[PDB]
Write a protein that binds this ligand. Structure first.
Ligand SMILES: *[C@@H]1O[C@H](CO)[C@@H](O[C@@H]2O[C@H](CO)[C@@H](O)[C@H](O)[C@H]2NC(C)=O)[C@H](O)[C@H]1NC(C)=O
Ligand SMILES: *[C@@H]1O[C@H](CO)[C@@H](O[C@@H]2O[C@H](CO)[C@@H](O)[C@H](O)[C@H]2NC(C)=O)[C@H](O)[C@H]1NC(C)=O
Ligand SMILES: *[C@@H]1O[C@H](CO)[C@@H](O[C@@H]2O[C@H](CO)[C@@H](O)[C@H](O)[C@H]2NC(C)=O)[C@H](O)[C@H]1NC(C)=O
Ligand SMILES: *[C@@H]1O[C@H](CO)[C@@H](O[C@@H]2O[C@H](CO)[C@@H](O)[C@H](O)[C@H]2NC(C)=O)[C@H](O)[C@H]1NC(C)=O
Ligand SMILES: *[C@@H]1O[C@H](CO)[C@@H](O[C@@H]2O[C@H](CO)[C@@H](O)[C@H](O)[C@H]2NC(C)=O)[C@H](O)[C@H]1NC(C)=O
Ligand SMILES: *[C@@H]1O[C@H](CO)[C@@H](O[C@@H]2O[C@H](CO)[C@@H](O)[C@H](O)[C@H]2NC(C)=O)[C@H](O)[C@H]1NC(C)=O
Ligand SMILES: *[C@@H]1O[C@H](CO)[C@@H](O[C@@H]2O[C@H](CO)[C@@H](O)[C@H](O)[C@H]2NC(C)=O)[C@H](O)[C@H]1NC(C)=O
Ligand SMILES: *[C@@H]1O[C@H](CO)[C@@H](O[C@@H]2O[C@H](CO)[C@@H](O)[C@H](O)[C@H]2NC(C)=O)[C@H](O)[C@H]1NC(C)=O
Ligand SMILES: [Ca+2]
Lengths: 542, 541
């Protein structure tokens, strides 16, 4: 049951409709005479940068970069021995209900186009490329046999990136759970510890393979967001005895923390044995400490604390703090979240060299209107377990009725331009979750208003709100370094391309380049925001 | 026929479905101590104003205001003896094809809500209110009997505006052609001169009635755009002998120029009589002088000049220039455009005290791809008569492939944020079309990216691209006064409310206030752009 089981799994994934194949299935050669599209006019970036950041530079060695993830950009879902993820299965069986009639078969075809992508990032003065490794390219069944062609693919991607002057930053796991492990024992809902062994075997292989060339690592991308998806399809089809939709989240939380700790131990041992280069390893946190709706009101103060504990604290306190879950989380979820043993704390405590925040926005916290005490006691309460008002007319709105900032578009309504709150977030995170190597802004970006292929190219490429958000956000990071003394190591924008955005597929556009999904070649065009990003780097790096 | 003909015309308009009646049919006011919604947070306008306008002020008496039009804001289409317009007919008989399933029966109900509207403009520091008079409120048949209740309505509107400290600026005609004149002789396609007499009697009545209180007047709003609409429904149903869909445009152009000249002579004589206050009269021009796609290319340079001649020059050269049509226009359209006589030039030449430009944006001019020369000599050519590439991938795009600026929603894709080109436009207009009283920016605004009946109120009210456009555009007007010495008299944003935008009805949002079309009260909410506008006034008046 090797390539034999691989076939079986793809046959199960493809029962209703097959994996589609890209128009281009060969590594692209950047041609000798390749012409970038002309620059926008000279006045186009006028008015974006304020005089307040005149003369401010990021520290020496600042990582000024872009971020993508394997399943969101690569395509080639079955190429060169790749096994299926939970998402391959979800989008081929539940496309209309869970996947917005898209699938990750092809996405941006970055699997074959990366050389061309890197020549275009080099044109913009980008100096860092954040990627994820597809677990099922390396172990198509999550455990057992190794796919050499997959290990060779990322060698070639890392080598290309360095030639184009992009420092490679690697993420081991960006939500693409191997389907085989889900079917065998329920993957991250495993009540045993085989998920931890299988993850650690995988992390060991990619660290040995790449960590002479990759010296900044993230084990997990946004583990809090990933564990919340384990409450639904396709994970809820395979729960072990004792797991339901509520407990699966907290089972996943604990297994991810274990996987992380054990993986960072192998990373440090490989460094200590001289097998790889001395580098830095952490994981990507997300979300925010919200502002209370009514300053000095203890209920809104409490609900904002509960938000931070469940969205950030539940992973960051064990790793960068006192080595245990927030007491607020323990008191609320009880036995559903397995106790960290002395042995667990042995690996997890101190297992972050660097902090990384996906600092997209900051929220407002209104205490649950039915009362924090009532909400805590009822797991069926829609606001459980944070027990603030979680919906859009509360999360983003002052008591005044006015928003915290610009909204992104109803499909991405969690996203606001909240640049003025960035310094407070960084101050909180570096004091509460201190790391020796400091802190990354590891993801930030805009899903732009009209552009959802409503349009002609000239309307798409002048992306004023994206350009505003990225300049806002970069400006505030500069001031964090210069006014708050933040040890900020980098800024990585999501993303360098419109890509496949999970349940929303290619309808959500996060790129500073447009990808033409009606063109066989999936041709990239720079938006104004890509030139805004380039111009900010030339002006504020050195 | 009097009362009798009014009835007949409404029965013709209402054949398929009647005029709808607002849930509010009484005057809406607010007490002095009424609480407006709370301001945005203190950081909300950070970043919009550039350091290069720090401490610069507009001239003393600068009109800092908003613009609406009777049919786009009032509703009350049949209240107090109003007669039907061509648009009342068009949207009741061809709603699905010509009107996007809307009609001007109700729009924002400004006819009854103006006191509330004025209290809210006062909260923003607005000092000027630009409005149009509905001809068919005054003469329900365009000619014959006068409707006192309609004259009384605008007295009460003008009085309310002045009490709330808004200088009232009056437009006599904003496209709302009386249906009766269209049916009788074809209105603006008249090959007689009854349209000129009927307009002049109307203009005379409103000038005597209001021009003690109103001291800035525009005869016609965007006459070039209005004459363009005379090529289609419902005007093309009633053309006199010898008028086409092509020739209708140029017949309308000529009759409007005559109407204007005769009406300005009445206005000056009224001023000289002392029976109204000494004021200023002009008309609102629109459109732009575009930048050639390939500067120094003779074809794009020519097509840019043809654009200016046919979109601005055809009205402004007779009035503010040498008193004749542009030579490029005459050589192209021939006898479809009636020759101006010595007598016509007698009234028309010098008939603008003030220039007014609806300066929403600047285009790019690409010469017709089939050849400028081939296009001019056709008439069936879709790019005739300007003979540039008229469509969006040409009018807004450099040969580079990058736009001239930020685009508005595809529904309003004619609109770009082209603030950098504003000073060049004002320079060209004041030098080419000089007026003694100077120049108004009489309309500018943004149709914000798909905010329409899709969203929650917090999402609507933080309108970043509207806010950006209005601050951009106010900044450049301020700099035109300082850097170029432009005698700029005012800046009037379109509009103070989401309103009824002709063919698009209430789907296109131009307001710095949201109007809730799912609320019986049509409740107004300030957008951030309204506070941006208020803050700019406080900082730079
Ligand atoms: C697995 O989780 C999915 C994701 O929520 C559940 O989804 C919905 O559940 C409701 C309750 O019946 C259904 O009516 C919805 O229509 C479901 N949506 C879809 C896409 O199926 C689902 O109930 C769960 N399935 C199991 C077996 O527990
Ligand atoms: C999901 O399983 C958890 C246990 O993992 C359930 O939570 C407990 O429910 C029992 C009753 O079955 C109560 O006596 C306990 O107080 C609850 N425990 C905790 C830790 O709160 C939960 O009820 C199940 N959820 C669903 C949807 O059936
Ligand atoms: C817990 O909150 C939930 C949902 O907000 C409530 O669940 C309902 O309970 C009633 C009454 O017993 C049932 O008839 C409904 O069918 C339940 N489901 C939903 C989705 O509303 C419940 O009211 C809350 N429990 C407590 C003790 O406050
Ligand atoms: C996306 O790609 C398609 C595929 O080429 C583009 O479509 C072409 O548009 C040009 C002129 O603009 C025409 O000559 C061709 O007829 C089109 N080809 C096809 C096969 O449709 C499309 O314009 C691109 N879209 C954007 C927004 O850039
Ligand atoms: C008046 O103009 C309209 C178009 O503005 C004409 O009606 C349209 O004509 C086209 C071409 O024949 C049709 O295919 C459309 O479906 C028509 N539109 C509607 C809503 O009916 C109309 O014929 C013109 N009238 C005259 C007298 O020439
Ligand atoms: C009425 O429009 C017709 C088309 O509906 C136009 O046709 C031409 O008339 C011109 C006058 O400019 C003559 O010089 C030509 O012989 C006609 N031929 C062509 C190919 O256009 C007409 O121009 C309009 N009529 C008038 C008198 O202006
Ligand atoms: C004048 O312009 C018209 C309108 O574009 C031209 O008509 C098109 O030209 C060719 C004739 O070979 C046809 O394939 C198209 O079907 C015509 N359009 C329409 C709407 O029927 C016309 O040929 C031009 N005449 C000259 C002398 O240049
Ligand atoms: C426009 O006004 C309407 C009418 O009051 C509002 O309608 C309410 O809409 C909310 C939408 O979340 C509903 O839950 C309410 O029950 C509705 N009431 C009625 C009578 O329909 C609507 O919210 C307003 N919209 C905006 C953006 O302000
Ligand atoms: Ca700015």
């Amino acid at each position: 049951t090797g390539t034999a089981e691989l076939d079986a799994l793809w046959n199960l994934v493809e029962a209703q409709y097959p994996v589609q194949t890209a128009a281009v299935t060969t590594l692209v050669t950047v041609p000798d005479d390749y012409k970038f599209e002309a620059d926008p006019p000279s006045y186009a970036l006028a008015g974006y940068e304020t005089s307040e950041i005149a003369g401010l530079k990021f520290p020496k060695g600042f990582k000024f970069g872009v971020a993508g993830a394997a399943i969101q950009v690569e395509g080639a879902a079955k190429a060169e021995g790749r096994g299926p993820s939970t998402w391959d299965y979800l989008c081929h069986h539940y496309a209309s209900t869970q996947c917005n009639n898209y699938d990750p078969d092809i996405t941006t075809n970055h699997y074959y186009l990366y050389p061309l992508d890197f020549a275009r990032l080099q044109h913009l003065g980008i100096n860092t490329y954040s990627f994820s490794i597809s677990w099922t390219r390396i172990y198509p069944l999550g455990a057992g046999y190794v796919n050499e062609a997959g290990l060779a693919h990322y060698d070639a991607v890392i080598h290309s990136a360095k030639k184009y002057g992009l420092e490679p930053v690697g993420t081991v796991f960006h939500w693409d759970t191997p389907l085989s492990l889900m079917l065998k024992y329920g993957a991250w809902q495993d009540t045993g510890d085989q998920i931890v062994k299988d993850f650690v075997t995988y992390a060991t292989t990619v660290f040995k393979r790449y960590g002479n060339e990759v010296k900044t690592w993230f084990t997990f991308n946004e583990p809090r967001v990933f564990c919340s998806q384990n409450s639904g399809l396709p994970y809820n089809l395979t729960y072990p005895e004792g797991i339901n939709s509520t407990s699966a989240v907290f089972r996943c939380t604990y297994n991810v923390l274990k996987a992380h700790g054990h993986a960072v131990k192998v990373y440090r041992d490989l460094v200590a044995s001289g097998t790889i280069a001395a580098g830095e390893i952490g994981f990507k946190s997300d979300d925010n400490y919200p502002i209370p709706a009514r300053p000095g009101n203890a209920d809104d103060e409490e609900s904002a604390k509960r938000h931070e504990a469940f969205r950030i604290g539940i992973f960051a306190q064990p790793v960068y703090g006192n080595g245990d879950y927030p007491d607020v989380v323990k008191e609320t979820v009880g036995d559903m979240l397995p106790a960290l043993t002395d042995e667990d704390k042995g690996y997890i405590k101190g297992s972050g060299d660097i902090f990384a925040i996906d600092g997209y926005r900051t929220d407002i916290s209104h205490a649950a209107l039915n009362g924090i005490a009532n909400c805590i006691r009822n797991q069926s309460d829609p606001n459980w377990p944070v027990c603030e008002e979680g919906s859009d007319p509360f999360a983003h709105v002052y008591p005044s009725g006015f928003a915290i900032g610009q909204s992104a578009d109803p499909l991405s309504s969690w996203l606001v331009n909240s640049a003025p709150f960035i310094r407070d977030q960084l101050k909180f995170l570096t004091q509460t979750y201190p790391a020796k190597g400091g802190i990354y802004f590891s993801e930030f970006g805009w899903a732009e208003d009209a552009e959802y292929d409503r349009q002609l190219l000239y309307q798409i490429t002048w992306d004023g709100l994206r350009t505003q958000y990225l300049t806002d956000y970069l400006s505030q990071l500069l001031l964090a370094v210069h006014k708050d003394g933040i040890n900020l190591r980098g800024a990585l924008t999501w993303s360098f391309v419109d890509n496949w955005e999970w349940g929303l597929g290619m309808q959500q556009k996060f790129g500073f380049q447009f990808v033409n999904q009606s063109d066989p070649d999936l041709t990239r065009t720079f938006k104004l925001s890509a030139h805004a990003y380039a111009q900010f780097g030339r002006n504020h790096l050195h």
